[PDB]
Design a protein around this ligand. Structure first.
Ligand code: NAD
Ligand code: NAD
Lengths: 361, 361
């Protein structure tokens, strides 16, 4: 009922948010990361005379996302329920100036297309990198120690120790490799310190400190194939870039030790769907697990749901209640800064001044 | 077909082993811990002119265990499929001199009764204490991060991030308490080092080093109730003694923080069955998980199978293929030493010279 705002010329800005529905779970106000509570920023936007419109309806061209997209200045996405911003969707977005990811990973945006339009793309760098590091250890131990079939077995009334431990091992004196030595890569190695690994290995374009490598008890592998062929466990910790799409194909998976484990809480598309299914069926992989899929939601018939020895979940690790707090705060901050014509922290920029952040090249 | 042995007077000794069946999984000879492969010691016993008899049939009084028990000199048990050696069963065991546990925890033996008969009870101290420490971290992360419902959800074709993360948290800046600062207690704290806990706490009759406490980043809690009321997560790491039976009752569970997590890979009976079920149903417990049950096998109707927020499996953690190697070797060694009238390592003795090891008092 108020026509103006505290912005230039009192132009009312429209902020569009796409979040999953929490339905009854939204009764917990700590549950910020959902369409119902919308990061708890509605009153703070409405009180500036700005418009705040949110939806969980992002799929197909009849979507609330496509309706509302035309006159939106600011788009908030979340990786857990990601608005896929194609060249077409960006081109219809006539007022769009800022794309902010409530989480980490902005690959659900056409970054090359956003860059060409001079749009700004940002994410809450660092906000759930500890949460994913914890979940990666979870997935390693669950696959190595064969937890899931055992939990299934006793929940359905059975008792057969052998049907579980015929495929259960200890992590001690095994070799773990992280593809990526970024924030999550490093938080993983910090958390694998006490497990008495043979070696902790990382592959990245960037050497860490010699001092950092000592701190993390890790060693750099120059060649990826050289790292993979030493590893009992492989963890994916890169963004989804043009370099990293389908990086874990037939060829690259056969380069891994027989019965080795593949954990991916980075992005599904970094691992070829059919290649992971088959190597799980053959046993060339001891198992595959992660919260991330090449389509979000994953179609009912995504094979990663039904393949053997999998530790799959929906996209949960970076959106625990504790993670939601951090990326909510970071999202509000960047919208605050944008309205104040203030630079974001340099690390939060994925696309700025028509250029992609070096880690997406 | 040979009537004598390399023992005193060439008395053929009978070694009785009770193991679970591995059926087809016994095709893997690394799968030592099963009735079919029987720790791979048959030829080494038979070649000394000793008798080796093994069975998975240990339950009821019509059992192969009860038939064979009468004339057995040496009994090998395993906690994963434990022969319950009651006062009655011991009294029928006319030749029995040595009870050796292929694993750790000999509570499935009436130790007070074994002590009265002057029998020797031993276990492979240290043999799977790293394996259980790993699995305890597994169970903590699985319960805190709510893995299991998510794995169930996607395996049955669903997709609902909220139905999982409404009860999913991060471990960082939370407080973990281990009831027991023994081998597993210590291997747990070593593995929780990198998780940025608020505090790592332990309760034990025995202080560790001041130097050890620094090494483990831990602090001692004198009063159990004082430890419990600070703890987001509680891990059970004591043997099942007279002190520790039903230690986790109604009263003691209500002393834990609301929505706190209880992990038990020690022994089921340390936690009252109904008390754990109810506190899981009320949410006073965020969840309960472990591989150990007060009856082994657990009856089809054990409530811990069907209660909410559980991370239960059969008894697997201390009998991964890697653990089986270590307790097989230790069992063969102690039988070797017994035949040579050689003392076992002091730590392997549960019952010696009519006395119980201090940690079972
Ligand atoms: N499951 C979740 O909820 C969740 C949450 C957080 C992040 N993620 C995913 O994890 C990714 C990693 O996050 P982060 O915080 O570690 O980011 P980061 O930018 O700190 O780390 C990424 C690392 O990858 C390296 N890299 C990029 N392309 C490479 C290539 N071709 N070869 C070698 N190294 C390459 C970079 O040098 C960098 O060190 C995110 O981009 C996101 O896709 C998922
Ligand atoms: N799930 C499995 O497969 C598996 C495998 C290994 C052991 N376990 C169980 O774990 C138990 C612990 O194993 P461990 O290797 O740490 O043994 P440990 O003897 O090194 O540690 C036990 C600790 O409990 C303490 N303790 C005993 N009674 C106590 C009491 N009333 N109050 C306070 N402290 C008390 C002792 O002081 C000791 O430090 C075993 O007895 C066994 O029951 C299970």
């Amino acid at each position: 009922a108020f026509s103006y705002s505290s912005a230039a010329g009192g132009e009312s800005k429209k902020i569009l948010g796409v979040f999953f529905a929490a339905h009854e779970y939204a009764k917990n106000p700590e549950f910020l990361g959902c369409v119902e509570n919308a990061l708890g920023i509605r009153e703070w936007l409405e009180s500036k005379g700005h418009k705040y419109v949110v939806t969980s309806d992002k799929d197909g061209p009849d979507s609330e996302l496509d309706k509302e997209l035309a006159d939106a200045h600011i788009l908030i996405t979340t990786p857990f329920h990601p608005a896929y911003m194609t060249k077409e969707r960006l081109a219809k977005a006539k007022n769009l100036e800022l794309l902010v990811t409530a989480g980490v990973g902005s690959d659900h945006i056409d970054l090359h297309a956003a860059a060409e339009k001079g749009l700004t793309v940002s994410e809450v760098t660092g906000s759930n990198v500890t949460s994913v590091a914890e979940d990666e250890v979870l997935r390693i131990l669950v696959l190595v120690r064969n937890f899931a079939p055992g939990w299934k077995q006793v929940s359905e009334g059975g008792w057969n120790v052998a049907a579980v431990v015929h495929h259960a091992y200890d992590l001690i004196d095994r070799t773990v490799g992280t593809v990526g030595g970024g924030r999550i890569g490093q938080e993983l190695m910090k958390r694998l310190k006490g497990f008495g690994l043979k070696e902790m290995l990382y592959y990245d374009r960037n050497s860490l400190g010699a001092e950092r490598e000592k701190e993390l008890g890790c060693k750099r592998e120059t060649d990826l194939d050289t790292m993979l062929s030493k590893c009992d466990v492989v963890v994916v910790n890169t963004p989804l870039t043009d370099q990293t799409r389908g990086l874990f194909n037939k060829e690259r998976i056969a380069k891994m030790k027989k019965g080795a484990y593949l954990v991916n809480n980075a992005r599904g598309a970094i691992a070829d769907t059919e290649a992971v299914k088959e190597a799980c069926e053959s046993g060339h992989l001891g198992g595959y697990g992660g919260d991330v899929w090449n389509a979000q939601p994953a179609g009912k018939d995504h094979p990663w749901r039904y393949m053997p020895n999998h530790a799959m979940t929906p996209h949960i690790s970076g959106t625990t209640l504790d993670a939601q707090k951090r990326f909510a705060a970071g999202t509000k901050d960047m919208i605050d800064r944008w309205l104040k014509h203030e630079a974001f922290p340099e690390q939060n920029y994925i696309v700025r001044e028509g250029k992609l952040a070096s880690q997406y090249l």
